[PDB]
Symmetry: D2
Subunit: 57 residues, 4 copies
């Protein structure tokens, strides 16, 4: 599996079967962006995971 990871495409470890992408703003001037390979999402974050190459663009 390959995933986007902040400007590059990376090959996942064999135990990471998903790509992930999520973002949040804890404060109006601070953005946090999570993006890369991952294991399964929580159910509440089900749509933040996908499992095909480069799907988390």
């Amino acid at each position: 599996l390959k995933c986007y990871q902040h400007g590059k495409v990376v090959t996942c470890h064999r135990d990471m079967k998903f790509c992930y992408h999520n973002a949040g703003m804890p404060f109006r001037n601070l953005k946090l962006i999570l993006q890369g390979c991952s294991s399964s999402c929580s159910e509440t974050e089900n749509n933040k995971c996908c499992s095909t190459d480069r799907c988390n663009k």
Copy 2:
């Protein structure tokens, strides 16, 4: 597998075979702490993962 996750103990998803704990300070007044279940660590973060119950305390 069970891991600490910021004050609680959680049961990992079956595809998460590790517990993880890492911290960083991007600025002197900001601490980020990552703690919970995970998949395998990067080699550069090898000692941030462990694979026994509650090992990431």
Copy 3:
């Protein structure tokens, strides 16, 4: 003005008239802790700011 800043006590710059302390969980495994000298808070966070020495313990 002096403020706590992650285990230490620091002297604020003269244009920073507040101390600040807040914590949150942008993601379930990620804890953010913001503590130290500060300029004025947003209106809704006015109680996270204080203006007396070491008030942000």
Copy 4:
């Protein structure tokens, strides 16, 4: 003073005399972007602060 703040232009509080913009990667999958009005920078980050309208694009 007016500053960029993640896609918008905002007016600073009167005690915030600077605009700020910086980004970093605390962890390989985590990008942090800090942009908006600010008090004075740390000495080593003096070039991340500026004091003219919209200077932090």
